Symmetry: D2
Subunit: 282 residues, 4 copies
């Protein structure tokens, strides 16, 4: 079943401005209510897709946003203009998070520019579909882990110096961690690592008053998709879930708002499943 | 195990909130509504106290009209009504026994008569009778527990279906005990496991009609259910075993329900939101 | 099309009427005295999964008391396979939706076998509906009474007789984990069983009694043509990654594992035997 | 918490089993084999001690020839070879470092060369380095922990694929910590979560080739990994926290692996067997 136009992109991270149709990253009807007023946020991969929607929604809730991303300057710039439109501060932090030192630098830079750090959203990811395990090279395996899970370790480790009672960490996992994906074996393994990391870290930081939770999206129309899958696969993206459609990035943002604010003060170690109705024994 | 609350007990269940010390915090003063549920017509079973009270009030702050079903706690229901009506929305009180199938049908009929329609159903009524082991659960207790905890959810929802359309929503209150078990509430836990599966199954049934079905699994929350079911000693240490080392307050549950009841969760169905102080449940 | 299109106008179904006959026994299954001299009570042990379990348990040396509703022909056949193994077999017909009969099958099991070591709660009925609005109160209560209340009553009666080293196994279902839109009440009963297994495990762990469950996926049994329509029956089990329904004999080793001392460090768990459906297990 | 074992600790990791008091029990003398692995050749990583030794021996009793890959615990490996061959099967020892990709490939090649074929792969190697928090986990430790705990499972399995056919089987040792989390083993836990997802995805990838892929999730088992990774008092209380109030013995894990390795589990793929002393994990 065809859900989107057939399309593919040469390189990854994907570029949102090349997508047809453009992901819906903002809900026009969304009304902010100061849920994150004055909070300082760092978001990895906040330039496009889900991260773009989360940055914009956080801004509408009064948060100042530092956005880390690889090199998609056009996308990062567009996200920044939407964020600043809400009258909050926005800081752009380009660079390769597969490098430990850079993971430390983005936290240091966030604190320098915003004054402090309250909420960290680990959201960066890359994915390289392959027809079977025999087609996953050592080079691809390690690249996939270094960006998808090691960056979450290093960035969070560096943020711990700055987080205090009342602060929050949110990790973007994926439905593939729960359900498996035969063409994304290494990627699913990194998302499964993120789930266990979220559980373990929540127990580690609970007595420090820092909450740790995750969001597990299903198929969401974002740049990650046409940049990883073939056209035919892209054209059918989202037809498999019970709502029979891919999710739009704005549909993920309120889950992050919920987890980031005092609204979830009694929530830690959990996962919010936003996936069109796929039952995962959640 | 350690003290979290004052030793207290109520000799009748459903419990009366006005008799609690400290009174549960059912409202967050800092909560700012933003029309998330503007003009929506809601039916909440057990919306007179505890979590249901906090949900009724938060929904009112979001602009929803609220029909509250409850057994017989008029004092608690009238108090809840005062807070709902403070928000300028309509509140309808529906007392009566939801262990009676006909009464489950009547509350839906009455909600539609008074509010004009029904958009969001929150199944939330429950009773619990702790026992030291299975051998202390009579057939009478087993049946009573299931009739109110899960059969009412079936009967009320069933009646609600002819009134729900595309964009409507159902939320079911389950419990952490469905996921983690509780050796002293074996029948009760079984009812909560039934709700979890009911939620999963009904979500798949209604997805093509555009009706979402989700749940909330609370951990230990300070509500009338606690002193009315547990003994004084266990009450005094309630919530001490969870990683945050305190029971939750009812106002801490309301936002999960708001999320699930509004367009904010448009891509969410068949799911459970665990609000339990940090207990990992492989969620 | 996985199976021949068929339907039975009565439930519980009769295995002897099915085409093909489910494979309830594995020719190569070799016993190794895993349950030698153990006294077992299995509810719904006359056919389908229950019959496979009775036979495998007999091959492991256990004496089997089989409770079933009224399928004398199916119960008699199961009894012949059990007795072929040189162990004792007791047939206990009757309706387990009645509390007193649940107590009676336990008493009768202890009378005939001398004691009770392993209880397998496995009885079930299912009535598919196109929606919730087609489930009567009669169907709802009957489904719960047999599917979960019998599990409470039989198990409760068994507690006087179980000691350190004894075991309880509850048959749940994949539907408790994944949901089933056509079986909403049945699914709720199976979710009840999962929580019941979890809670009871923690209640009995200090008494040395283990409690675990099995969650089968689509299994070719008399429950299938007796409940589902003929074109659903013909497509049965095509929805799982193994693209076939399971045979009852494929369920039996999971029960052997959970019943014997091979699972001495396992309580409160579920073994998922479902053709590869991932359930976040 | 309370004392379950003697206070003890070992200088290096991987640990040495012959140093432990009491010696783990790796065999159940009452366990009788019944040819459940008739004519099969197995490769077990980490099969020299702890759970891996218990599995090696049980597999031998079921009729399997066993190739055991391990790091450098020659004493433990040789003792294990002795137990295996005593059951009337062949045993091949494959020492070396599985954090190296090429070595992962070589152990598979050597197994086929010496045994003739490969039918069952059991990925079971691990290392763990407890730390009081995330700030105490260096990049060096993070990468080392991943390279051996999960990348080795990728490389060994990948190399094994050209040798596996319909009816063959993969089993991956995960851990309760992927489900419950562990605050002193944040990196280890993450490798275990990766194993759970690897198992799920790989089961779906190989199901049409007729190869099943499942996992075992142990709870606290008395093995050389414990005294070599934890401090003395921690070791002394090992297992006190699960409902059975004791750690498991390695022989208590073997039958789960036998179940998954044999045609007894022909209708099982993509699953986990939780052998943990009663910890509820929403399984
Ligand atoms: C993919 C899948 O299974 C389904 C679903 C689950 C989880 N994910 C998660 O959402 C998150 C990303 O969201 P997205 O889908 O909105 O795509 P996106 O491409 O808009 O955002 C991912 C970002 O990661 C950043 N990034 C990648 N490599 C980097 C590097 N080396 N250094 C610094 N930054 C780097 C990029 O800047 C990029 O914008 C990821 O954690 C991803 O796994 C998305 C989907 C989906 N879009 O369908
Ligand atoms: C018990 C447990 O696992 C802990 C936790 C999880 C879930 N629960 C769930 O929260 C919901 C109940 O809320 P609560 O804790 O706010 O207590 P509550 O007593 O304030 O609300 C329950 C309501 O059930 C209604 N009710 C009971 N019997 C009735 C009947 N025969 N007819 C009509 N109405 C009847 C009463 O009107 C009562 O107000 C239930 O679904 C309960 O299982 C609460 C807690 C907790 N308070 O700690
Ligand atoms: C059905 C489903 O969702 C998938 C799957 C999961 C679990 N189940 C479970 O397997 C178990 C055994 O069923 P089966 O499939 O082997 O079918 P079966 O009909 O052979 O066994 C069920 C038995 O329940 C007994 N029974 C029914 N009502 C009774 C009563 N009132 N009093 C005493 N006994 C009564 C009957 O004696 C009958 O033999 C049940 O717990 C069932 O829920 C089976 C399947 C399947 N057959 O595909
Ligand atoms: C720690 C924990 O979560 C609890 C529990 C769950 C899972 N684990 C799992 O069980 C397996 C470990 O077995 P064990 O507890 O029997 O410990 P063990 O030390 O007896 O076996 C682990 C083996 O890993 C091998 N190994 C380590 N590094 C290697 C390398 N670089 N190259 C080649 N081989 C290497 C060693 O040869 C060693 O014998 C692991 O997969 C581990 O994650 C054990 C326990 C436990 N023993 O309590
Ligand atoms: C053939 As290769 C580079 O995946 O080992
Ligand atoms: C610490 As609080 C205000 O969430 O009870
Ligand atoms: C009649 As109406 C707007 O509640 O669906
Ligand atoms: C002894 As009785 C009434 O719980 O069956
Ligand atoms: C403080 As460090 C060198 O372990 O990242
Ligand atoms: Cl097999
Ligand atoms: Mg981008
Ligand atoms: Mg009340
Ligand atoms: Mg029958
Ligand atoms: Mg060793």
């Amino acid at each position: 079943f065809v859900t989107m136009p057939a399309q593919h992109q040469n390189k990854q991270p994907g570029i949102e401005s090349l997508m047809n149709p453009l992901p819906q990253f903002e809900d026009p009807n969304y009304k902010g209510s100061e849920k994150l007023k004055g909070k300082n946020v760092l978001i990895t991969g906040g330039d496009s897709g889900i991260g773009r929607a989360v940055s914009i929604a956080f801004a509408k809730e009064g948060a100042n946003i530092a956005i880390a991303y690889l090199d998609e300057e056009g996308d990062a710039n567009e996200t920044k203009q939407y964020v600043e439109k809400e009258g909050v501060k926005c800081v752009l932090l380009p660079g390769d998070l597969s490098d430990e030192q850079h993971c430390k630098d983005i936290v240091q830079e966030t604190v320098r520019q915003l004054g402090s750090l309250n909420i960290l959203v680990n959201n960066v990811a890359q994915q390289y579909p392959q027809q079977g395990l025999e087609y996953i090279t050592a080079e691809q395996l390690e690249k996939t882990f270094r960006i998808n899970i090691f960056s979450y370790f290093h960035v969070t480790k560096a943020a711990l110096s700055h987080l205090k009672q009342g602060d929050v960490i949110i990790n973007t996992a994926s439905i593939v961690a729960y359900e498996g994906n035969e063409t994304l074996i290494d990627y699913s393994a990194t998302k499964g690592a993120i789930v266990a990391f979220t559980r373990s870290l929540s127990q580690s930081l609970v007595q420090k008053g820092i909450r740790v939770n995750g969001v597990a999206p299903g198929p969401i129309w974002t740049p990650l998709i046409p940049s990883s899958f073939d056209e035919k696969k892209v054209s059918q993206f989202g037809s498999n879930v019970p709502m029979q459609r891919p999710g739009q990035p704005y549909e993920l943002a309120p889950a992050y708002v919920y987890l980031a604010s005092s609204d979830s003060s009694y929530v830690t170690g959990q996962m919010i499943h936003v996936n069109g109705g796929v039952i995962v024994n959640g």
